[PDB]
Amino acid sequence: ELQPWQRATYDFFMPQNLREDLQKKQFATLQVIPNSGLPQLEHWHSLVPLDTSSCFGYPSWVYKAQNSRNGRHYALRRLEGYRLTNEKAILNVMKDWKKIKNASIVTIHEVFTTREFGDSSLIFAYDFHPLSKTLQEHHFQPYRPPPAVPENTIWGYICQIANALKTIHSNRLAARCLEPSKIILTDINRIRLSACAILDVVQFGMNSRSVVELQQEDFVKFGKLILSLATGTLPAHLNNIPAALETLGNKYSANLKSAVNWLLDTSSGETKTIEHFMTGIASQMTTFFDLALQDNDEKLFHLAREVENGRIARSLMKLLTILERGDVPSWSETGDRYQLKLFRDYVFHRVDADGKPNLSIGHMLTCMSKLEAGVDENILLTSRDNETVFVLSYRELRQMYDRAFNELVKAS
Amino acid sequence: ELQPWQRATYDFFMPQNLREDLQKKQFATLQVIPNSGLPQLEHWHSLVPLDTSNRKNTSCFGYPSWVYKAQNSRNGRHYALRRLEGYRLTNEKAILNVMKDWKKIKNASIVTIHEVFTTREFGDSSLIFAYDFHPLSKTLQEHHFQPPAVPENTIWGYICQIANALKTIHSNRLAARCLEPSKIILTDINRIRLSACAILDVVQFGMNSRSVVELQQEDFVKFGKLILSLATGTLPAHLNNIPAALETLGNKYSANLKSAVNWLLDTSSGETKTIEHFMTGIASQMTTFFDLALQDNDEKLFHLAREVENGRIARSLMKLLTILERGDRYQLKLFRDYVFHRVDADGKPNLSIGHMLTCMSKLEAGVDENILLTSRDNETVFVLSYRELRQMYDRAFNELVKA
Amino acid sequence: PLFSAWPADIISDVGAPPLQLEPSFVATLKQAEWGLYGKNTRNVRRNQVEDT
Ligand SMILES: Nc1ncnc2c1ncn2[C@@H]1O[C@H](COP(=O)(O)OP(=O)(O)OP(=O)(O)O)[C@@H](O)[C@H]1O
Ligand SMILES: Nc1ncnc2c1ncn2[C@@H]1O[C@H](COP(=O)(O)OP(=O)(O)OP(=O)(O)O)[C@@H](O)[C@H]1O
Ligand SMILES: [Mg+2]
Ligand SMILES: [Mg+2]
């Protein structure tokens, strides 16, 4: 119902949905409990529980916490009743996984034991991702049955996981946990492995399998995860792999069936490598490279507009500081400042032909932007009396505006 | 040697200085020229030339070409206008058919084409192509050939983005016809976009008889030559001896790069080359650059979250400016004086931004905390809460709204 | 009601070209090193919305 040249007030600002998502996540990050019984660890405080209600060998809790050195928020995963018996279990694993930096893996910053919860506990410190939900929560939570995962979403998942496995396997490690419950949606279609270091520590020195063997099992788990998502059945419920594969074959492309089958197939004589798997999904990967860049551009668009809102804001403050001071005498009403007052009237005190005041936010933002830029465009400022008129460029105005402000700075 | 791409640092798409970059690009978008000779077109105004040097060069299109930043009057947005000077369109079907194909195309590695139109408004026959505007873009030619070794990673990054463009173009039964360094623009750090896509399709519309598949095979060769030019620092026209250039590349870079470039150059294999086959061969690199794109996504989101309140702060300051001094009101004037006209004990002005933000924040919220507004001469004084103040300002504003 | 809240249904124009003045009129103005000033002859309300 709006002409292409005309904008509603809020079109000049960040769209409501994005604004609300950011605000909610800001709120989730800043949430605290002033007097919980929960302890402060030496470098961690303001612990906040996240558990609404498996992969590890211990009962586990997750807390949002704030680091005392840098003031940032991290997610602390606690394993209850873990006893330190070999420090290498903690130290070697921490050394290895601290190297790992990957967009599809929740970063591990620290692994440490503590008695501060009143038991022996093992703590893993992670990047905090506000308002995250697991793939299990998102796809398998009943009521009504959960809807069919679109094939495109699945290839998006496959590519992000392949990205994780590429980095994990190259560092001679294995992503050991690939359950829906230990993969988190940190944003729309954006998934991250969230429990990576943990299995390495708990099974340290008890596991007899080689690195390569654990890596082979990663592919099988990868396949079962996709199979769970395709057919809507929990991994625990996946009793019949072939029956699940056929369901997938009916609902999805042959290309997907082939990918899942390669991942499940332990019968070939061939050592499976993430390199070979990537080779088989190059086209999908290219598509998602493109979409990532497009999403970058979208975020950059909004970022550029809000940074400019900030610059405008600081400029409006400078304006208010300069105009109508109680004051040399009359400094505000004389010389450079006089034009600035007339400029303010031009920007903010517009009126229709009918004399009705005009409140178009678009005019105000643009004018302040042009002033900041010192544009070579002329405008017509009229005296309050209405007898006299002045024609100035924004460039000229900026010179005046800067001079007026620098005078105040000098006065110090 | 998978190592060069495996090594690439995580900041590959992240700007060195985001603050300065945004500010420069903001200024570039609003720039105009006080006395250009340039015309206003029916839907276009504020034309600004972007060509650094005013020299007639016709290399890719066969005609002199200019690029203008311009502002569309239909929607208020800025576009980049490619003008072919002295070009007369002889078949109108050329624009309609070509645009039907290319308007579908939306790709991170291709500058979107929106419109093609003829005009006499420059004082000649001219053909105009309207593109997305990318402020402060520079061509690969300007950037790599303007009087050191391009790192292999930068090259793989370029290769992945160009492959991304070619995937979309070839899938839509089209051909990127121009793959010259001068027609690929860096719109951001290590970020390239094909900038001349629609043009050859239009200019040669009747004349070119080669098939779609034939023009695509040529994409690969041109692609190969671009990489070869960058690797060895010699412009594509000077690339007289390809085998000699290939050995040079083989000495400075990995066997994988030599192999990829060789596949792109090879017309002898008897095999129809496909972008699907090429992507398959660079899958590892593509995954790395997918990761790097996503990490930049996280970086941008971080800054976005930090800047989210700026609109709210700006609108508040605007209402203050909208209400005051048009020609209760006295308290309002005193509040503005309290916030922005602070003075030191010595009578000198105080410019602490912190005071202004805290005050505007408390006003915004309508906090109950009480403040003391006094005229500088102490005769009159008021003790009010911010809650009371917001009530007052809003009433004034609602009066203004009524109209 | 937050103070930052502005009315949603207000419309702005964004496409318009910059103000072009009649050359006759510009002659009326008396040049200064920072710009031009003169007597308002036009029948436009002060700071009125201009349709370019
Ligand atoms: N790194 C993280 N940042 C933010 N939130 C996280 C992070 N890791 C996990 N969480 C959140 O903690 C919550 C609990 O996760 P957890 O995996 O412990 O429970 P679960 O998967 O429901 O358990 P179960 O496997 O028994 O069903 C989830 O909603 C998840 O989004
Ligand atoms: N979509 C765009 N947005 C912003 N700037 C662009 C866009 N496309 C091209 N430019 C810029 O316009 C300038 C001129 O580009 P153009 O390719 O026309 O000339 P050139 O490459 O310098 O010389 P030649 O025309 O001989 O190739 C370049 O600096 C380029 O970065
Ligand atoms: Mg839990
Ligand atoms: Mg040019």
Residue numbers in the entry:
A (entry chain B): 207 to 259, 265 to 353, 359 to 543, 547 to 631
B (entry chain A): 207 to 353, 363 to 542, 555 to 630
C (entry chain E): 355 to 406
From the paper:
The best diffracting crystals were obtained with a construct that lacks the first 27 residues of the PID region, ctPan2343–458, had P21 symmetry and diffracted to 2.6 Å resolution with two copies of the complex in the asymmetric unit. Molecular replacement using the structure of ctPan3 PKC showed clear difference density corresponding to a single ctPan2 chain (comprising residues 355–406) on each ctPan3 dimer. The major difference between free and Pan2-associated ctPan3 was a substantial rotation of the N-terminus of chain B (residues 207–224) by approximately 90° toward the Pan3 CTD (Fig5C and D). The PID of ctPan2 next passes over the coiled coil and interacts with the N-terminus of ctPan3 chain B (Gln212–Ala214) through an intermolecular antiparallel β-sheet (Fig6E). This new β-sheet is located between the pseudokinase domain of chain A and the CTD of chain B. The PID continues around Pan3 to form extensive interactions with the CTD of chain B that include an extended 4-strand antiparallel β-sheet between a β-hairpin of the ctPan2-PID (residues 384–393) and a β-hairpin ‘ear’ in ctPan3 (residues 597–612) (Fig6A). Collectively, the interface between the PID of ctPan2 and the ctPan3 PKC dimer buries a surface area of approximately 2,230 Å2, and the ctPan3 PKC dimer interface buries approximately 3,740 Å2.
Two conserved complexes carry out the majority of deadenylation in the cytoplasm: Pan2–Pan3 and Ccr4–Not. As illustrated in Fig1A, Pan3 contains a zinc finger at its N-terminus, a pseudokinase domain (PK), a coiled coil and a highly conserved C-terminal domain (CTD) (Brown et al, 1996; Christie et al, 2013; Wolf & Passmore, 2014). Pan2 contains three functional domains: an N-terminal WD40 domain, an inactive ubiquitin C-terminal hydrolase (UCH) domain and a C-terminal exonuclease (Fig1A) (Boeck et al, 1996; Wolf & Passmore, 2014).
